[PDB]
Structure 1
Amino acid sequence: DRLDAALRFQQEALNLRAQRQEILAANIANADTPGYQARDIDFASELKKVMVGVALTLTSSHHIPAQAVVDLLYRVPDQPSLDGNTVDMDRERTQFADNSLKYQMGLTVLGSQLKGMMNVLQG
């Protein structure tokens, strides 16, 4: 559908921001686990990958339709801890706040596009 193509980029950006938000909050929650590595995703490359499948064929009514079913990069440690935990509070707190801001911005842009498509139709 053409409607999907217009809203594909913002939807994928919003979903990627939510996933990275979950990853950052997991990094915050597991700050005290000894031996836990701080993981993160490269937002731009994954957004390229998602932006850049074959529903199985249903011959009749009984035939069952096809059933549907990111890469994590390690953060470079800054300070060496003794328990092997590489999670840094300041870095991930700033990243968490930034991801929240960008999620809000994506919501704003997507809502503006939908509202414009709506006022085009209203009449």
Structure 2
Amino acid sequence: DRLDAALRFQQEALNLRAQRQEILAANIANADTPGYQARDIDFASELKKVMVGVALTLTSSHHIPAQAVVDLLYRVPDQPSLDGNTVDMDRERTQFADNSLKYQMGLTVLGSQLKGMMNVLQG
């Protein structure tokens, strides 16, 4: 559908921001686990990958339709801890706040596009 193509980029950006938000909050929650590595995703490359499948064929009514079913990069440690935990509070707190801001911005842009498509139709 053409409607999907217009809203594909912002939807994928919003979903990627939510996933990275979950990853950052997981990094915050597991700050005290000894031996836990701080993981993160490269937002731009994954957004390229998602932006850049074959529903199985249903011959009749009984035939069952096809059933549907990111890469994590390690953060470079800054300070060496003794328990092997590489999670840094300041870095991930700033990243968490930034991801929240960008999620809000994506919501704003997507809502503006939908509202414009709506006022085009209203009449």
Once the 2 structures are TM-superposed, how far is the Cα of residue 5 of structure 1 from its aligned partner? 0.0
1:62-104 deviation line (CA, Å, top 9, x unaligned) = 0000000000000000000000000000000000000000000
Partner of 2:91: 91
Task: Give the structure-2-normalised TM-score.
Answer: 1.00
State the Cα deviation string for residues 6-62 of structure 1 (Å, max 9, x = none).
000000000000000000000000000000000000000000000000000000000
Task: Give the TM-score normalised by the residue count of structure 1.
Answer: 1.00
Residue in 1 that maps onto 2:120: 120
Between the aligned partners of 1:75 and 1:61, the Cα distance in structure 2 is 50
Mapped to 1, the partners of 2:121 and 2:28 lie a distance apart of 45
- Percent sequence identity over aligned pairs: 100
SS at match of 1:59: coil
Give the Cα–Cα distance (whole angstroms) in 2 for the partners of residues 93 and 53 of structure 1.
Answer: 37
Unaligned runs of 5+ in 2: none
Which runs of 5 or more residues in structure 1 are unaligned?
A: none
CA RMSD between the two structures: 0.0
